Structures are given as structure tokens and as C-alpha cells.
Amino acid sequence: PGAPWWKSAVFYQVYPRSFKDTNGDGIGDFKGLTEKLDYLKGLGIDAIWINPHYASPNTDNGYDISDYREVMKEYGTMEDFDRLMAELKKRGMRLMVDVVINHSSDQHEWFKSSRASKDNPYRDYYFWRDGKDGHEPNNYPSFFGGSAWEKDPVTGQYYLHYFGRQQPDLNWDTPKLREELYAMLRFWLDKGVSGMRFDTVATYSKTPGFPDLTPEQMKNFAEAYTQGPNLHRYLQEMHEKVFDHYDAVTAGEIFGAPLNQVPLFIDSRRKELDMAFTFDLIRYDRALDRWHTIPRTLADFRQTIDKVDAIAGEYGWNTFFLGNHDNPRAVSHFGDDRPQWREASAKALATVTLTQRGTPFIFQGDELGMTNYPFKTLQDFDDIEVKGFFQDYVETGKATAEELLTNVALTSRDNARTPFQWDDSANAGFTTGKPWLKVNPNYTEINAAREIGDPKSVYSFYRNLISIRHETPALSTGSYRDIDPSNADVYAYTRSQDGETYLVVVNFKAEPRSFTLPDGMHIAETLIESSSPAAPAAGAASLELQPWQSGIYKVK
Ligand SMILES: [Ca+2]
């Protein structure tokens, strides 16, 4: 039997708002993305996942949808969307769209109807509840600041919003609402979309009665929000009424759930989702408050990967990524972005990304080695999440504005949202106008035009790794074995399939290091290396590594 196309595909994530502007308003759009499909095809990309592209007031840049069947005005028209799909198809590429159905915008007609009175047909499309003891229904906090309950004087009741106040949570306990969501998914699937990524998929089911979270639960309320008693029943119902009738791949952003529960979402036999986006690795060094960083080592990094790979088991499947639109830049976060180590470490991280067991997702700009942005003031951030941290921590006196800036500069989602750096023209060729978010001044040294023309660039390395992965089945669907989970200097593992075994060795130190192959194992051939002055000799039982050197070898 063969493995589904998605298990061996290499995905690229495009945050439209920041990819390519073609009309000078400072915001990326569909025409811009369509104009760059040859660029993506040339890198070797099989499929693209685009962030929300629907009608939205943009309080959470696309994640607050006011009409699920209309395109976002800033990105273009439905015609532009249809052309994007037609052009991807001409190139044999597939599209994965973002599905945001844990909540809608408060400007969605369902909510405008719902909030108008206590007795209308849409009242239960959301959660409305009486306050208690003079305040909110319970102690639930919002990820974006303050309480997760907002009072509406029209009826005197509060509505639930785990995220922004303008993102009321949809009520999955209402069958008519579930059916409306299913019809909506069919609208897009009928257009030919090849994949759907389910935004905060683990929070759909709410706890009956809304009791207060205990003091312990309050510490990590994100986890309690993924413990709704009807979650899997709803996901299985969605698969039965929708996905069982199409051949689209589904992936879930499983935010907040304990890793041990992940199999329930992805075991193929359960007929729920196909792939998992987990946060254990990308948030492995993030404090519970989400804006401070905790020092970790490569031992923590690889041990987390080992735990995540183990939960996919036999019937599950993981996506793998080191960056996305909600986290700091890969090279800054996991590598060393200083001028002298940025390219070397970005290449090392590329080797890791493209040799993990699972479907890799490359975030726009990481193939160039883009870095975090040098924020100078709190006003340099656009993200509603930072305004939420200001509300919860600075206005409350828990931290100073200076402390928030210092710390959130290293963790903010905005680090990943600065405009893609195409070349060294005005605003790195992203726009002819004024970018919605400032372009990183390092675009003069980090830009696609320059990378493409240099065989020694980060871009060229990614391109070469993608080709290698495409020609080596073991590198996608092969088994995974960490040679030494306790080693905090050099990351080494094997990928094996049908008697073929490959060894990946990556030095995470900016100093020379040595690596001794497992007893009986010997280098047979060197497929590729980064930052190496010479490949090992056939038969070698050890390797000498330069700072940040990475390599993939066929062993015997
Ligand atoms: Ca535009």
C-alpha cells in the first residue's frame, strides 16, 4: 500500500497579509500570492496552507470572521481566490485553508441576531449566561485580556469569548449551529480545496454548567478549555457528515491539550482528523503566562520531539514545524541569529525540519533565514495579544511597560508577521506603499532575490533538502529513533524504511564537537552537509563537526 499524499508532502505556510502586496495599500493579497506560485514551486513546495482569507473586521487578523462564504476585502475578490486555486492546480499544487469555527466575529450576522434578544432562533448559536454574585458567570479568563465573559446590556447576560471580546465562541451543543458549520465547510470543499486546518480545534466542547476553574486549573486554564465532554463526539460527527465525503486532508491546531490526548484526534481509526499541529515543541521554552521565556537545552528539545513522535504511534500522524504566524522566528528561537551564526544555524534547523517523521510545514521567510524584529516600543506591536498582556499585567501593576516590552519582544506573534523580504528595493519589494507592519531593516542582507542567486544560501540549502527528502522515502515515512536523548550538544537520529537507514547529525553548539556513531554503524554515503569543510570517508565510525554543522548520511 502507498502512504497518503499528505504524509510525504512538504507544506509551505503563507500568512497572506504579509506575503505580497500588489496594490500598494501595505497589505498582502491573493494576486500577490498568485504572482509568486512559481517562486514556491521552484523551492519544491507541494502544498500551501494559507491563514484565514474570509470576510473579517481583522481584530485578530482573519481569525474573527464575519461571513464564512465571502473573501476578506483586503485580499481581493472570490474571483481572485478562484484564480489562485486554478493557478495552483496548473502547477500540480494543493491548497489547505484555515477553518475558524470555535468562534466567529461579533459582526457575523448570527451574532448580531443572537445578541438582539433572549428569545430569537440564534440565541443559542453562542453562549449567553447570567452573571453570579454581582459579576461574571464564572472565573474564566480570556487569552486576549480580562474575563472570557462580556456583558451585553441589551439582555443583561454575558457571552463567552475564550479569545477576543470581538470573537464570541460558537455553541457546538446546538445541532442547528453544527449543521450550519457543516454546510459552510462543504461550500469550500465543493470549490476543490485540498485541506483544512482547524483553528483551536480542542476547545469546541464547553463544560456543562460552566463551573469555576479551581485554583490549580486556573494556573493553566488553556488545558481546562480542551476538556469539554463532547469534543470527540463533535469531531467524529463532522468527519461523518463532511470529511467522509471528500478527499481533503484535515489537520488540527490542538492548542492547550495534554500530549497524551492527541491520539484521540489523529488515530486514523477514530475517523476524526488526519494530522496534528501540537505546541509542545514550539512552546517548550515558554512560561505559562505566554510572554516570558525559560532557558532550555537541546536535551529538552529532542526529548519533547521524542514524546510527540511516540504519540503518533501506528495510526496517527504529526505535522512538524519550527515556526508559524503565532511564534517567534525559527532561527531566532531555536538557532543563533547573530550575524556570524544566522545562516549556519538556519541551515542546521532546515536539516532538522526536513528530516523529521511527519509532514513538515515551512513558514514563509524561514527559507531565507528571516529573524525576529527589533521592536523599540509597545506601539511597534500590532497584535491584540500584546494589548491583552498590557491589560492583564501592566494596568494591574504586575509588571512595568518596560518589562512587558523586553520580554514580549522575544515571544510576540508579530516577530513572524513582518513583511516577507523579496529583494532590497523599498520595503524589501513587499509593497510600493506603507507596510501594515514595519519591514525588518535586515532586508538589505536577507532577501529572496539575493538568496536565489547564491548556491551557498539558506534558500538554496532548503531547496536542496526538499529535493533530497522527495527522493528518499525513509525521510518522510520512515521510523524515527533518537540515538541519545540525553545529549545536549549534538542532535543525532536515524530514519529507516524497507531496510534503508539514514543518519541525521546536527551540532547545536557554536563550537567544534565530535560524534561517535552507534556500535556497528558506519557511514556509507553523505547526502548533504551544511557548514562542513569535508564529508566523512566511507566507512567512518565517527564524525568531527564544525560549529552548527548539519548533515544527512546513508549508513550501513
Ligand atoms: Ca494589497
Question: What topology is assigned to 479-556 in CATH?
Answer: Immunoglobulin-like (2.60.40)
Of 198, 194, 164, the closest CA to residue 84 belongs to 194
Which three cell numbers mark 151?
456583558
Q: According to CATH, what is the number of the domain 105-174?
A: 3.90.400.10
Q: What is the stated resolution of the deposited model, in angstroms?
A: 1.8
Q: How many Å lie between the centroid of ligand 1 and the Cα of residue 81?
A: 14
Residue 544: strand pairing partners: 514
The catalytic site residues sit at: 199, 253
Q: Which own/partner pairs from 265-269 qualify as long-range (CB within 8 Å, at least 24 positions apart)?
A: 265/201, 265/202, 265/232, 265/235, 266/312, 266/315, 266/316, 266/317, 266/318, 267/313, 267/315, 267/316, 268/315, 268/316, 268/317, 269/315
Q: Is 21 annotated as a binding residue?
A: yes
Spatial neighbors of 407 by CB under 8 A, at least 6 apart, are 291, 292, 293
How far apart CA 464 and CA 312 sit, in angstroms, is 28
Closest among 547, 368, 540 to 443, alpha carbons compared: 368
Can you spell out the DSSP letters for 499-548? Answer: TEEEEEEEE-SSS-EEEEPPTT--EEEEEEEES-SSPPPTT-SEEEE-TT
Give distance in angstroms: CA of 56 to centre of ligand 1.
15
Question: What is d(CA 76, CA 70) in angstroms, rounded to the nearest whole number?
Answer: 10
Three-state SS at 189: helix
Residue 317 one-letter amino acid:
W
Neighbouring CB atoms inside 10 A of 347's CB total 29
Q: What share of the chain is helix, strand, coil (3-state, %, to 5)?
A: 35, 20, 45
Round to whole Å and give the CA distance between 443 and 438.
11
Residue with cell 524504511: 497
CB 192 within 8 A of CB 172: no
Q: Are 371 and 331 in contact (CB under 8 A)?
A: yes
To the nearest 10°, the Cα dihedral for 484, 486, 492, 493? 50
Q: How far apart (Å, rounded) are the C-alpha atoms in residues 78 and 88?
A: 15
* Three-state secondary structure call for residue 257: coil
| CA dist list (Å): 534 to 351, 360, 537 | 17, 28, 9
Query: Measured between alpha carbons, how far is 543 from 555 in angstroms, rounded to an integer?
Result: 13
Rounded to whole angstroms, the Cα distance separating 162 from 167 reads 8
Position 555, amino acid: V
Which three cell numbers mark 50?
494559507
1-104+175-478: CATH topology: TIM Barrel (3.20.20)
How many helices (H) and strands (E) the chain has is answered by 17, 20
Instruction: Give the Cα separation of 519 and 399 in Å (integer).
Output: 53
Measured in angstroms, how far is the CA atom of residue 36 from the centroid of ligand 1? 14
Q: Say whether 105-174 and 1-104+175-478 share the same fold.
A: no
- Within 13 Å and on the Cβ side, how many CA atoms surround 312? 22
Nearest to 74 by CA among 20, 30, 19: 30
Are the beta carbons of 93 and 100 closer than 8 angstroms?
no
- 387 Rama class: left (phi>0) / alpha (psi -120 to 50) / beta: alpha
Report how this structure was experimentally obtained: X-ray
Q: 128: which 3 cell numbers?
A: 449567553
Contact 445, 343 (CB under 8 A): no
In angstroms, what is the span from residue 27 Cα to ligand 1's centroid? Answer: 4
Q: Where exactly are the structural domains of the chain?
A: 1-104+175-478, 105-174, 479-556
C-alpha cell at 368: 531565507
Quickly tell me which residue has 458567570 as its cell.
137
The 8-class DSSP code of residue 487 comes to -
Between CA 162 and CA 148 the distance in angstroms is 5
**d(Cα 254, Cα 277) in Å, to the nearest integer?**
6
C-alpha span between 286 and 288 (Å, rounded): 7
User: b/e for 292-324, b at 16 or more Cβ within 10 A?
Assistant: beeeeebeebbbbbeebbebbeeebbbbbbbbb
Structure-block grid coordinates of residue 522: 558506519
Instruction: List Cβ neighbours of 235 (8 Å cut-off, separation of 6 or more).
Output: 201, 204, 265, 272, 273
Centre of ligand 1 to C-alpha 470, Å, is: 34
Phi, psi at 243, each rounded to 5°: -60, -25
Region of residue 271 (phi > 0: left; psi between -120 and 50: alpha; otherwise: beta): left
* 368: DSSP letter: G
Query: Considering only CA atoms, which of 231, 103, 200, 98 is closest in space to residue 160?
Result: 103
User: Which one, of 23, 97, 25, 106, lies nearest residue 54 by Cα?
Assistant: 97
Residue 346 gets the label, from left (phi > 0), alpha (psi -120 to 50) or beta, of: alpha
Residues near 81 by Cβ (< 8 Å), separated by ≥ 6?
A: 30, 53, 71, 75
Q: How far is the CA of 31 from the centre of ligand 1 (A)?
A: 8
The residue among 529, 528, 532 whose CA lies nearest residue 547 is 532
CB atoms within 10 A of CB 401: 13
Q: CA 111, 112, 116, 117: dihedral to nearest 10 degrees? A: -20
Tell me the β-bridge partners of 252.
198, 276
How far from chain centre, in Å, is Cα 124? 31
27 assigned binding-site residue: yes
Query: What does the radius of gyration of the chain's CA atoms come to, in whole angstroms?
Result: 24
Cβ-proximal residues to 469 (8 Å cutoff; 6+ apart), any chain: 10, 354, 355, 360, 475, 476
CA 201 to chain CA mean position, Å = 13
Q: Are 25 and 419 in contact (CB under 8 A)?
A: no
CA-to-CA distance for 180 and 85, rounded, in angstroms?
24
**Nearest residue to 265 via CA among 305, 195, 319:** 319
- Measured at the CA of 116, the angle between CA 114 and CA 119, to 5 degrees, comes to 70
Euclidean distance between CA atoms 416 and 282, whole angstroms: 13
Helices (H), 147-230: 175-189, 215-219, 221-224
Angle (CA) 127-128-133 rounded to 5° is 125
Q: Measure the CA–CA gap between 170 and 178, rounded to whole angstroms.
A: 9
CA of 252: how far to CAs of 49, 169, 329, 412, in Å?
Answer: 12, 18, 21, 22
User: Are residues 81 and 53 in contact, defined by beta-carbon separation less than 8 angstroms?
Assistant: yes
The single residue listed with the C-alpha cell 504529526 is 318
479568563: which residue's cell? 141
CB neighbours of residue 433 within 10 Å: 14
Please report the DSSP string for 403-451 in residue order: HHHHHHHHH-GGGGTSPP--SSSGGGGS-SS--SSPPPGGGGTS-HHHH
Question: How many angstroms separate the alpha carbon of residue 54 from the centre of ligand 1?
Answer: 15
Burial 8-30 (b: 16+ CB within 10 A, else e): bbbbbbbbbbbbbbbeeebbbbb
In the chain the first and final C-alpha atoms are separated, in Å, by 26
Residues 6+ apart with CB under 8 A from 113: 120, 121, 122, 125
Contact 14, 51 (CB under 8 A): yes
Residues contacting 283, CB < 8 A, separation 6+: 290, 327
267 is in an annotated binding site: no
Query: Which cell numbers in the block locate residue 478?
Result: 520512515
Distance 520 CA to ligand 1 centre (A): 58
In whole angstroms, give the CA distance from residue 63 to residue 15.
Answer: 12
Judging by beta carbons within 10 Å of its beta carbon (0-12, 13-18, 19+), is residue 395 exposed, middle or buried? Answer: exposed
186 close to 242: Cβ distance less than 8 angstroms? yes
23 marked as part of a ligand binding site: yes
- Residue 320: phi and psi, rounded to 5, are -140, 135
CA 168 and chain centroid, separation: 22
Q: 444 alpha carbon to ligand 1 midpoint, in Å? A: 22
Strands 128-129 and 523-530: unpaired
